[PDB]
Design a protein around this ligand. Structure first.
Ligand code: SF4
Ligand code: SF4
Ligand code: FES
Ligand SMILES: [Zn+2]
Lengths: 177, 198, 687, 39, 86, 90, 56, 92
């Protein structure tokens, strides 16, 4: 499903706590003013929201003694349709929202020229049926999010009769040279 | 079809306050019935099952859970109706299923429970069925299920000194740590892992 | 509004729909090979045949309009038989080429056969064989795979505007392509590959290297041209493998230019991977970040304020320019140019001063377009295709400047600036031609505004617009447009940097990745140069200090479109070697120089940006402006004297216009194969 | 009856409903955005 | 004190069922530690200091001397986040 | 002739050529290019030739059909599975 | 040379679903819960009959 | 009137940020729409940056030498008080 709760749709305002953000308090206020108040699948303006590391981020399992880098990351939430190479795939795309994490380290170990990831996280993408589900997951796990909204091909009038049209009278003079 | 079948309808006759939603499918055995059960009646329902005649000769065959927060149809998205059981996999945080076999009625019974609370809490039935101890321990450690009134809550298959739920969709199959020998300490340690990718 | 039936479920559609359109809107997928959503309707293949009651013959869904009360049965056995027969005929002569075919894993023939075909063959004869043709280094041909779907012919005729493709012959022996040995040289050429459903036409640079299932895709925007084309980047590990177009319908529609698609391989070579320092004799030594930053900090602390200058590069993002502007303002520096000529004579006071006020889609809305020193065929090929589509729908194009071989018809008003003076002073028929037009539109190329009389040309254009009615509150229309040539200049204008503030004599120059229009006389011989950059073609040879930076695909940044749209460029792979982010380098340098900047992450830098200009925080959006008539008001007593010099363009070689494209191999191959053939001193009078 | 019955019934009712998708939805070309000018 | 720092880092929790689950896990890990089920080099990850060297070996203060008054950003800029050979 | 020249690239599928064929023992880790170049051209009587790369089906490669009626008479063509080259007899 | 029926036409994929109301639910509760009556018009013959006919 | 004839050697930039349609930015919007060219003519080189957003608060940001900024809130300020705010900002 793609098209379907108020709190999940509510985007909290930023509160400055760091000295750097206390310096730029006017910018924080302006960002709070201009950003959309609520997020819905019908929106047109994308936006970036910081992680909310309050009591709500208690459900994450990725805060371990050896890992202090997963919580607080900012994901990307968007719809990835079928590419421009084929029209009728056997498994179609575009029916779900993708949450993606940017790469953190990629190199080639030299003994056999083998590709290695310096960050085991962010290797695979996460899939949700609704945008609200992805935002709720991010709020649960203490993730920020960059939400971008889909672009769709317009509807147009198609007919075979358009291939055979009368050029018009031979006396139609073009005054535009 | 080509065999004697009857629904397990007496269960909802005794429990008069519950809605009844049952399925039969040709993808299952012809004696297999699937029903939907609310979470706040599961312990009483199992108490009724363990002792009621024509149900008492029953055994618990399997237990597990489904993380449906990332469940999406990949093909034939326009062939779904309101009666499909998969229609209950949407917007639901967690699912739990139990499978029993009844010798008197020669029947398979699967019960499905929808967990929609963030802490994933449900009553345990290991005090009714002795099977449920290890099964529920493994389910709880794999999927983060919080079982209440359980005989034993210790980890069953996971490594010592670790807290993780590897069977959630958010978890990558390579984990977050690797085990190496440390010369400076003459013993094995765990470190953040860098892994090859194909 | 009529009611039809699709597999028993009633539905309501419009009477102008085809069966295919109704089925797709109602969620029903119909296989197809020759129908395309942007080309004309053809019915040559028959894979979209469906079954309808009271109609004995199967009806082609794509080429047949809906009838009130009709019933379409796409799940009947008759439809299955029709699809199986058509698939059998399609595969009778297809070659056994899937292992060697670049279409494998994403071939529509393969998937359609697997899902709808009978699943086995009975044809046991010789297949036809076709000799391959040579179309150039961008398109590879394997013509045994062609199914005669006409998609390439229709794309070339109706989208690219070139008439070199066709179908010659008859029956089974007919062949698709040019009759003679001729290359398929054009911008947007590679797009035809994406149109062809089979491996008949393939991406020649992307030959044999990769498979679809071993790629990860990212959504981003292009910077090679000032249109922010929406693109998809496909990578395998740390290597970027290909670039594909996306769908936007307000930018580039479905299509990308060849430079956008192929010049990305210039990021794999000539890269700067570590900080460097140059000796007096010219020797370059690799150094640490700490030493370089300390050297530049000592220079900043010792150099007087009036001797400090900067150059803003072509590929400069909002964050980098914000960082550099804040740091140099802290250093009491307000000059961001040292070059004597080539500066844009536009005030950054208002957004309407330097932007495309009618947006990219405005070419569809206007009826008269006037280009002034603009060559859309090279500066924005997708916008050129849009203008061609509009001219097929009653759009008239007039041109002042160099006559160009646009694929449509344009009227040459003149060559020099005397035509503009005649129009502004009246007594020229084009003034009345503009007045009688419903929505006049003027597009001045940015290049013509770096003339020594760029301000006078700007004032003349404002006078012409206000007098004719290009800008008018009655029509609620703003037809004044500027087509820029650099993304960094657009970002600097958006932040508020005056491009005409030039330091005459600077002893310390920060070159933020600028390589175009750089000559040794611009930089004094006794100056200290710090170049921030990713490539070593130019600028890196002027620099005492070289600091490696991140490309557009290697950082999370914000880019402003030439029409005013704010977009996210997203990180795809980290910068190679020891390179660092631009704003991170500037912040580290500011901290080491005793004037630290109040931001430590991208979020705080964006808070500073919101302090400067809030509209840069709205992504994939254009902020409206209500000061168009105030900004473009014809001021009294301003100079309007123009030099009697012809107005030209700025592009000679389309394939190589910047450092990344200059460091590309496929761009060099395209130059070698196409520059001699595309060069002409005369107009093609056919078009 | 038990206190938690109502939530269970509500989540049962929510699950079964028509599920349309964002794609396959008709989007027309928007009209020209007329420019507004201050006095 | 180190384990108290761990608990303090888990202070923001507000779901009682989650807290009961965590208490069960803590009791389990403590029992594993007290019966030699786990290895000392593995279980020491919960008792180790957060910003202090261990007492059984020496420590290096090189990055303290070179990056004396520099902020955290500058320290993380001079020391990269990826290998530099590739 | 310069391998980077226009003519050499145009007559080599727009690839930089190697007449010695000895770059492939390092780049492609084998000497197969030399060995296949050691095989002369096969002259066929008809206009079309069928290649399977062996004496029987499943011993070789899938059946492919190569056109020998070229724009320039007698231009040899190469099988895309096996490196064998064919031309129409006279 | 016969290829039209290499793929199965009939397959064992049928599923059958049964849904029941609560057994202990009375007629009045069923009428009220289904939006054919309100709590005020309970214990009235005309309201019960109208709700029953509307349900039927 | 003499204050706007010359811009002080300490002032470097006057940036105006407000809303397109909100009643809060009504005074600043009208002031910019009436007195922009009067200031621009007397100081043809001095930058006067105007940026607007959908819900931005009205601000008059004055920048001085060495990167010193002084941002003043200009909400619900009519023509005279906007005049006075700008005069005081260009006076320090
Ligand atoms: S075009 Fe290529 S992948 Fe596609 S079916 Fe034909 S040979 Fe196979
Ligand atoms: S070469 Fe390909 S795209 Fe062109 S007409 Fe043939 S099958 Fe269609
Ligand atoms: S898709 Fe309809 S005839 Fe080709
Ligand atoms: Zn062969």
């Amino acid at each position: 499903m793609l098209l379907p709760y108020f709190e999940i749709q509510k985007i909290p305002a930023k509160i400055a706590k760091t000295a750097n953000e206390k310096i730029l308090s006017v910018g924080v206020a302006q960002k709070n003013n201009i950003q959309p108040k609520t997020v819905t699948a019908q929106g047109q303006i994308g936006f970036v929201q910081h992680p909310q590391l309050d009591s709500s981020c208690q459900y994450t399992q990725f805060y371990t003694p050896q890992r202090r880098d997963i919580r607080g990351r900012v994901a990307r939430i968007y719809i990835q349709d079928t590419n421009h190479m084929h029209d009728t795939p056997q498994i179609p795309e575009g029916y779900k929202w993708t949450l993606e994490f940017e790469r953190q380290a990629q190199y080639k170990t030299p003994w056999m020229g083998w590709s290695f990831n310096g960050d085991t996280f962010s290797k695979r993408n996460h899939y949700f049926c609704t945008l609200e589900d992805a935002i709720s997951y991010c709020k649960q796990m203490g993730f920020g999010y960059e939400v971008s909204f889909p672009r769709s091909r317009y509807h147009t009038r198609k007919s075979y009769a358009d291939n055979m049209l009368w050029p018009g009278h031979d006396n139609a003079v073009d005054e535009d040279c | 079809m080509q065999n004697k079948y009857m629904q397990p309808i007496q269960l909802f006759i005794v429990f008069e306050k519950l809605n009844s939603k049952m399925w039969i499918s040709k993808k299952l055995n012809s004696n297999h019935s699937i029903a939907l059960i609310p979470s706040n009646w599961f312990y009483s329902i199992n108490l009724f099952l363990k002792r009621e005649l024509l149900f008492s000769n029953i055994t618990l065959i399997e237990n597990s859970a489904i993380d449906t927060i990332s469940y999406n149809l990949e093909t034939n998205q326009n062939d779904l109706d309101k009666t499909n059981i998969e229609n209950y996999f949407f917007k639901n945080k967690m699912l739990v299923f139990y499978n029993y076999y009844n010798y008197f009625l020669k029947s398979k019974l699967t019960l499905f429970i929808i967990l929609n609370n963030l802490n994933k809490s449900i009553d345990s039935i290991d005090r009714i069925f002795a099977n449920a101890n290890w099964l529920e321990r493994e389910t709880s450690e794999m999927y983060g299920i919080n079982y209440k009134w359980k005989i034993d809550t210790r980890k069953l298959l996971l490594d010592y000194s670790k807290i993780e739920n590897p069977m959630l969709k958010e978890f990558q199959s390579e984990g977050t740590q690797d085990a190496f020998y440390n010369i400076f300490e003459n013993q094995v340690v765990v470190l953040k892992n860098e892994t090859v990718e194909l | 509004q009529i009611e039809i039936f699709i597999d028993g479920k009633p539905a309501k559609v419009d009477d102008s729909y085809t069966i295919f359109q109704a089925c797709y809107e109602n969620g029903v997928i119909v296989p197809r090979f020759c129908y395309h959503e942007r080309l004309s309707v053809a019915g040559n293949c028959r894979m979209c045949l469906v079954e309808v009651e009271n109609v004995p013959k199967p009806v082609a869904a794509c080429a047949s309009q809906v009838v009130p009360g009709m019933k379409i049965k796409t799940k009947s056995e008759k439809t299955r038989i029709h699809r199986g027969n058509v698939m059998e005929f399609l595969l009778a002569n297809h070659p056994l080429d899937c292992p060697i075919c670049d279409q494998g894993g994403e071939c529509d023939l393969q998937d359609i056969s697997s899902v709808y075909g009978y699943g086995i063959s009975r044809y046991n004869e010789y297949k036809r064989a076709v000799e391959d043709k040579n179309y150039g280094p961008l398109v590879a041909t394997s013509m045994n795979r062609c199914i005669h779907c006409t998609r390439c012919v229709r794309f070339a005729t109706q989208i690219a505007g070139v008439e070199d493709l066709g179908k010659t012959g008859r029956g089974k022996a007919a062949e698709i392509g040019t009759y003679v040995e001729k290359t398929f040289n054009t911008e947007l050429s590679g797009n035809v590959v994406d149109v062809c459903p089979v491996g008949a036409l393939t991406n020649a640079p992307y030959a044999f290297t990769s498979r679809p299932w071993e790629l990860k895709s990212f959504y981003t925007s292009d910077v090679f041209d000032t249109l922010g084309s929406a693109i998809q980047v496909d990578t395998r590990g740390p290597e970027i493998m290909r670039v594909l177009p996306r769908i936007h319908e307000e930018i580039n529609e479905e299509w990308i230019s060849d430079k956008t698609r192929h010049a990305f391989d210039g990021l794999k070579r000539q890269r700067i991977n570590s900080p460097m320092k140059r000796s007096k004799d010219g020797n370059y030594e690799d150094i640490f970040w700490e030493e370089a930053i300390q050297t530049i900090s000592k220079k900043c602390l010792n150099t007087p304020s009036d001797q400090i200058g900067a150059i803003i590069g072509e590929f400069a993002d909002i964050e980098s320019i914000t960082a550099l502007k804040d740091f140099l303002n802290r250093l009491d520096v307000d000059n961001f140019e040292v070059r004597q000529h080539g500066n844009l004579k536009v005030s950054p006071d208002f957004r309407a001063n330097y932007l495309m006020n009618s947006k990219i889609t405005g070419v569809e809305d206007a009826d008269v377009l006037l280009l002034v020193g603009c060559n859309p065929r090279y500066e924005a090929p997708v916008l050129n295709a849009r203008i061609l589509k509009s001219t097929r729908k009653n759009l008239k194009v007039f041109n002042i400047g160099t006559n160009q071989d646009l694929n449509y018809k344009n009227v040459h008003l003149g060559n020099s600036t005397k035509v503009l003076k005649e129009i502004a002073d009246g007594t020229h028929p084009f003034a009345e031609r503009l007045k009688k037009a419903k929505l006049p539109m003027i597009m001045v190329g940015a290049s013509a505004l770096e003339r020594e009389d760029g301000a006078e040309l700007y004032n003349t254009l404002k006078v012409i617009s206000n007098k004719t009615g290009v800008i008018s509150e009655e029509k609620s229309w703003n037809g004044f447009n500027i087509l820029h040539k650099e993304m960094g200049r657009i970002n600097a204008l958006e932040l508020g940097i005056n491009p005409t503030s030039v330091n005459k004599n600077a002893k310390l120059v920060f070159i933020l990745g600028a390589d175009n229009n750089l000559r040794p006389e611009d930089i004094p011989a006794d100056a200290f140069v710090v170049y921030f950059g990713t490539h070593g073609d130019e600028g890196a040879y002027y620099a005492d200090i070289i600091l490696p930076t991140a490309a557009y695909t290697e950082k999370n940044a914000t880019w402003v479109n030439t029409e005013g749209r704010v977009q996210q460029g997203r990180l795809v792979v980290m910068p190679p070697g020891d390179a660092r982010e631009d704003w991170q380098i500037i912040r580290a340098l500011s901290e080491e120089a005793g004037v630290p900047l109040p931001y430590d992450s991208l979020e705080e830098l964006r808070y500073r940006v919101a302090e400067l200009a809030p509209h840069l925080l709205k992504y994939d959006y254009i902020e409206p402006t209500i000061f168009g008539k105030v900004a473009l008001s014809a001021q009294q007593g301003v100079k309007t004297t123009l030099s009697p010099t012809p107005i030209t363009d700025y592009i000679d070689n389309f394939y190589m216009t910047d450092a990344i494209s200059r460091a590309s191999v496929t761009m060099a191959k395209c130059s070698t194969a196409f520059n001699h053939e595309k060069f002409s001193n005369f107009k093609n009078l056919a078009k | 009856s038990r206190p938690g019955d109502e939530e269970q019934n509500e989540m049962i009712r929510i699950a079964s409903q028509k599920r349309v998708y964002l794609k396959h939805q008709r989007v027309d070309r928007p009209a020209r955005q007329e420019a507004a000018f201050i006095s | 004190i180190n384990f108290g720092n761990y608990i303090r880092e888990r202070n923001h929790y507000r779901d009682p069922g989650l807290i009961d689950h965590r208490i069960q896990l803590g009791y389990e890990l403590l029992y594993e530690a007290e019966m030699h089920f786990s290895q000392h080099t593995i279980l020491m990850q919960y008792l180790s200091p957060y910003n202090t060297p261990l007492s059984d070996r020496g420590y290096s203060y090189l990055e303290k001397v070179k990056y004396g008054n520099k902020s955290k950003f500058l320290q993380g800029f001079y020391k990269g986040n990826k290998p530099t050979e590739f | 002739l310069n391998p980077y020249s226009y003519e050499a690239l145009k007559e080599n599928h727009w690839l930089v050529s190697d007449s010695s064929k000895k770059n492939s023992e390092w780049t492609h880790k084998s000497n197969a290019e030399q060995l296949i170049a050691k095989v002369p051209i096969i002259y066929v009587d008809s206009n079309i030739v069928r290649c399977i790369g062996g004496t029987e089906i499943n011993a070789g490669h899938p059946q492919v059909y190569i056109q020998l009626d070229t724009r320039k008479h007698g231009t040899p063509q190469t099988c895309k599975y096996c490196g064998l080259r064919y031309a129409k007899k006279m | 040379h016969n290829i039209r029926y290499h793929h199965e036409i009939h397959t064992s994929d049928q599923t059958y679903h049964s849904s029941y109301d609560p057994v202990g639910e009375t007629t009045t509760e069923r009428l009220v819960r289904y939006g054919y009556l309100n709590k005020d018009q309970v214990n009235n013959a005309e309201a019960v009959a109208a709700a029953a006919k509307e349900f039927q | 009137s003499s204050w706007q004839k010359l811009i002080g050697t300490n002032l470097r930039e006057l940036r105006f940020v407000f809303c397109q349609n909100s009643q809060r930015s009504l005074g600043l919007r009208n002031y910019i729409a009436k007195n922009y060219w009067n200031l621009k003519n007397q100081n043809p080189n001095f930058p006067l940056i105007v940026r607007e957003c959908e819900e931005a608060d009205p601000y008059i940001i004055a920048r001085y030498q060495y990167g010193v900024e002084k941002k003043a809130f200009a909400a619900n300020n009519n023509e005279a008080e906007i005049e006075n705010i700008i005069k005081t900002l260009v006076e320090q």
